[PDB]
Design an enzyme around this catalytic site. Structure first.
Site, PDB file in Angstrom:
ATOM      1  N   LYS A   1       0.796  -1.235   0.000  1.00  0.00           N
ATOM      2  CA  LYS A   1       0.000   0.000   0.000  1.00  0.00           C
ATOM      3  C   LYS A   1       0.813   1.262   0.000  1.00  0.00           C
ATOM      4  O   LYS A   1       0.448   2.229  -0.670  1.00  0.00           O
ATOM      5  CB  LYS A   1      -0.904   0.054   1.230  1.00  0.00           C
TER       6      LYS A   1
ATOM      7  N   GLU B   1     -10.608   7.496   2.998  1.00  0.00           N
ATOM      8  CA  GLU B   1     -11.492   6.787   3.905  1.00  0.00           C
ATOM      9  C   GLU B   1     -11.032   5.346   4.044  1.00  0.00           C
ATOM     10  O   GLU B   1     -10.300   4.840   3.192  1.00  0.00           O
ATOM     11  CB  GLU B   1     -12.962   6.921   3.470  1.00  0.00           C
TER      12      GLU B   1
ATOM     13  N   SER C   1       2.181  -9.771  -0.220  1.00  0.00           N
ATOM     14  CA  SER C   1       1.770  -8.371  -0.166  1.00  0.00           C
ATOM     15  C   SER C   1       2.025  -7.656   1.163  1.00  0.00           C
ATOM     16  O   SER C   1       2.222  -6.442   1.158  1.00  0.00           O
ATOM     17  CB  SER C   1       0.295  -8.229  -0.564  1.00  0.00           C
TER      18      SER C   1
END
Lengths: 385, 241, 385, 242
Positions: C82, C104, C371
């Site tokens: 991310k 959000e 990930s």
């Protein structure tokens, strides 16, 4: 085995032969072409080395003084420099033909490191832990069991670290033919203080290359936290002969030196013999280990490595303190300013670096050793804040 | 430094208090050929669980170094039984080697074992010990090679103290066998004796003395100030009387 | 804008001008020398880029089949891929002259990623969060706050993610002159799906170079988990023109597809138009979003990226599902076997990789995109275990 | 597609249920020159808090798509007042564009506004709408440039629907209206959205062909539910100055 007057191998006859075997094994495999090839493979491929040297652009502008680089050991696998030594010794044990690792832990940070390294190289890992510490460290204990290790709660005496050490040593004395005992820091009897330093020296070698790459010159100061000494020696050692580089080890000031709740063994301890080494220890009038305190669990240890005692003696390194309160401000300040949540142990180093940077010129250079990430400290920091 | 065939009680000093330790020694003196007296230490990395607990107990109740010497001095008012002081190095180191051994000799200490001071780090200790009228005790374990055991024997002026890694282990009788073969000094065994079979068996295989520690400190741990009579019953069991 | 028939910009007129200024700005700065120089500076020094390609030698030999490499995104700063996108878009926002970031989140992982990148680049950061999710994710809320962001709880409607999206999008329409809206996956209206992919393509470019270095050849298969698509698309994209390499997306099977407690949008959802994109969504008989589940919080999203929908149509990538039980089995397995505690999201990709290795020979190669790290998932895993 | 100076009630279909919406439409018909009817949707992006709630109230009550058309068919038994259908694109996409607009037309619907279908994506939609006898409605915001507003007008065959971004009618909202009256050839209705009599009279005075009322009415339907009818009429009477 000596660092000046400090160090040695002050153990009973039962522990002599296992240590003499380790001395011999380290001697042959320390400079072995194949050993180092495997060690560097794992450090790169599994641990993520090298770690970056990050220029804290926002933090230095805020303070208005010297440039502040963070050696990002928070980014290694596990989230702390401890992985470097964990792999190094675990690999040495495998090259010795051992099938099993043991260690002891208080906070659990060393237990996790040992378990991770044992998992990587496919070794049985039994980790001794004080029964008090098992209830305290619910999440670290679970973390070890995930990695294939099994924790042995010791229910005798204080039920603290010190009792787990005794169980671990009694176990090693009997099982050393197929078992290696993994020490977390640059502490204990010879050859552990030298072995651990040598496995952490990567930090300084990488950092020296990186600072020459970024600045074209060596730094003015290097700041690092000191509990036992592991991370501090790793980054210090390669700069020891560089007469320009000032070395500053930062101990846990706790609630303040006047309060007596701290772990500043170098600042406030006496020279004595515990845990198999002549070094600095925090002791009472009668020469018994005192209770220690620090908000950072990794710095909560009454002793300190004998090599740091030596550096203190000959005045190569300067040793200082930072309070719980000060380290906690640094924990918050770095998170806001650089988007890096430092370990509470490392926050001590950051906190002092920030004080020192204010008094320095804007063309001067400081390297702070960011020994780990502080994801593990969020429960502690939430309760206190 | 003690009569062959002897039983040697080991007690930790100040467990539960100094007056109790003196009471125990005086009650056990008629049974014993020599006595070992442990000095409490915060981090005793050698000792097994039962002795380890006694260090914790004695310091929790505020034991101090000068109280060990007081016990040996007040014991000497009644008895001239050999006393061997068992300590870690830090009390000796912080007081000064000569200062410690002189003060030990003045109390009436006959011998001394520094648990965590290896043979190669004891060149000076043995030297001053001889000068201050104190005999040296060094220990050997089953993993101790024959090369070191001779060097251990050479530096010992009291007795070599054999211990086990862990009824009585096979590996422990091999150590005793080798020791009597190699050592000019007398030998005391501290293999964790709990019953009469063991005392007889070890005397038979040539142990000059049989040390009784855990069995007595377990009782002191259970009974405290009231241990005196239970200690006697235990020592009588081990002497077979 | 389009990937075959999928994608688009299906939003109201209020959101057109903000999106068109972002279109123009991305086209400007995307290939700019100075933007890319700064982007790679932060990815290198701050994020810890590149990440290593680990060879799971014990996991492959235990399976007794094909080789299994792991792309170690668990080692990036923050513990998850991310961060790559978060820095990219935050930097892009800075080059656009914006002082503020908004986003959000439900699970909190994206909210943390945004808060981190904002703190780095001196951006003000407001995260909108459903007040139920605030109550669940106590620790991520705290993490965001430490990082300098303020978490705005929305108490309107359900108090869940979709109510926070509305509040965030309303805020952007008003404040877009000085505020960037930071989408966390390859989802939503153009240009976000292409933008997020581009900032995650680094993963694939590194993996390609690294597997050639290790094995002298491209892999047979690449396996990666798919919630919205961010990580999978990042490792996929640079192999899209290589006809040899197979691409496999692992969706969240949850408690099973027959049980209806899944979040596998591609495998068992229909095409539709929500959140500004034409793509596969988990809808009911009436064409309204059905509730979704997975044990891995990051996979619990009813939509999926339009580019994954395109690769599904043209059959350039296979797509599969793995159950909560299997991901948990992989979570434990990789921990014990390799000393790496993967994220529950990644553990889906590992769980499938372990199956697929059995049906391939020892000379064939699989790259699993690991990930993130699973330190975040330990409470979840401790409860179910 | 409606008389100038008209008040336009916006209600959400199936809030709380299909019959109750029809009851409100029949109650408000004699006060209105046209009516907007929203189709419920799980993830409404455009809409404000009051509408957003009513979407969830309707779908929690088990709203089906067929029931929106049922209201208009039933309403058409009593009235020939223009009905505008306000929806997101998914229901249209799902059913088929010609199929939805034909079924809407067949139910008795005059206008349609696809909230999340931009002007450039509506080429095929406005082409089929003309063919099916449905008038297109396209919205504009304050941040809509003069360039795009001309395109919005060019494609609108019903009315241009102006909206503010988020007390009082904002200064920014009057600027959008003034611009729209300069530029647009179509009629203009405004959802700014309204709560007092001063607002309605002021908006008509500055050239609004219609004033839409949504939030004032659906807030009452949120409070009162089935019992809202009489409170809606009282509120509309206030806004008309009756």
């Amino acid at each position: 085995m000596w660092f000046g007057e400090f160090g040695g191998q002050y153990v009973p006859e039962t522990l002599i032969e296992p240590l003499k075997e380790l001395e011999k094994a380290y001697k042959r495999f320390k400079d072995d072409e194949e050993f180092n090839r495997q060690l560097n493979y794992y450090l790169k491929t599994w641990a993520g080395r090298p770690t970056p040297l990050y220029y804290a652009k926002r933090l230095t502008e805020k303070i208005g003084g010297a440039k502040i680089y963070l050696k990002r050991e928070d980014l290694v696998h596990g989230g702390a420099h401890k992985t470097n030594n964990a792999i190094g010794q675990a690999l040495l044990a495998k090259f010795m033909g051992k099938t099993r690792l043991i260690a002891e832990t208080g906070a659990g940070q060393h237990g996790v490191a040992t378990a991770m390294a044992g998992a990587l190289l496919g070794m049985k890992v039994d980790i001794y832990m004080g029964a008090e510490d098992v209830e305290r460290q619910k999440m670290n204990v679970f973390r070890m069991k995930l990695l294939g290790a099994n924790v042995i709660p010791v229910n005798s005496g204080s039920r603290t670290l010190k009792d787990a050490i005794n169980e671990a040593l009694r176990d090693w004395v009997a099982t050393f033919e197929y078992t290696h005992y993994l020490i977390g820091s640059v502490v204990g009897p010879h050859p552990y203080p030298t072995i651990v330093r040598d496995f952490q020296s990567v930090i300084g070698r990488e950092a020296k290359a990186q600072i020459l790459e970024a600045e074209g010159q060596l730094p003015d100061v290097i700041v690092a936290c000191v509990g036992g000494g592991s991370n501090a020696m790793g980054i210090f050692y390669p700069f020891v002969n560089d007469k320009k580089v000032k070395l500053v080890g930062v101990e846990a000031g706790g609630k303040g030196l006047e309060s007596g709740k701290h772990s500043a063994s170098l600042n406030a301890g006496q020279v004595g013999v515990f845990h198999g080494m002549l070094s600095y220890f925090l002791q009472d009038e009668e020469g018994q280990i005192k209770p220690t305190h620090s908000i950072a669990p990794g710095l909560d240890y009454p002793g300190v490595g004998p090599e740091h005692a030596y550096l203190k003696k000959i005045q190569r390194a300067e040793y200082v303190t930072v309070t719980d309160e000060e380290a906690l401000k640094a924990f918050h300040e770095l998170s806001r300013t650089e988007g890096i949540i430092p370990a509470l142990e490392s926050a001590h180093a950051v906190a002092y670096a920030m004080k020192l940077a204010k008094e320095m010129s804007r063309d001067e250079i400081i390297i702070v050793n960011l020994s780990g990430r502080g994801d593990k400290d969020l429960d502690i920091v939430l309760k206190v804040s | 430094m003690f009569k062959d065939g002897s039983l040697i009680p080991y007690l930790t000093a100040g467990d539960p208090d100094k007056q109790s330790t003196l009471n125990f020694l005086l009650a056990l003196d008629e049974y014993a050929g020599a006595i070992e007296l442990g000095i409490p230490f915060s981090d005793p990395i050698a000792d097994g669980k039962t002795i380890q607990e006694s260090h914790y107990r004695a310091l929790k109740n505020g034991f101090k170094l000068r109280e060990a010497f007081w016990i040996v001095k007040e014991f000497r008012r009644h008895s001239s039984t050999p006393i061997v002081l068992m300590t870690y190095y830090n009390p000796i180191y912080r007081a000064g080697v000569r200062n410690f051994l002189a003060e030990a000799k003045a109390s009436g200490v006959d011998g001394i074992l520094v648990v965590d001071l290896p043979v190669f780090h004891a060149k000076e200790f043995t030297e001053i010990a001889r000068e201050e009228g104190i005999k040296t005790v060094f220990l050997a374990a089953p993993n101790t090679p024959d090369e070191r055991l001779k060097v251990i024997d050479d530096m010992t002026t009291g007795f070599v103290y054999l211990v086990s890694l862990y009824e009585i282990p096979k590996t422990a009788y091999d150590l005793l066998r080798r020791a009597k073969r190699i050592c000019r000094n007398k030998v005391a065994v501290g293999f964790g004796v709990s019953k009469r079979e063991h005392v007889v068996s070890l005397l038979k295989e040539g142990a000059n003395g049989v040390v009784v520690g855990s069995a007595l400190v377990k009782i002191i741990g259970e009974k405290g100030r009231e241990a005196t009579e239970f200690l006697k019953k235990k020592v009588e069991e081990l002497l077979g009387i």
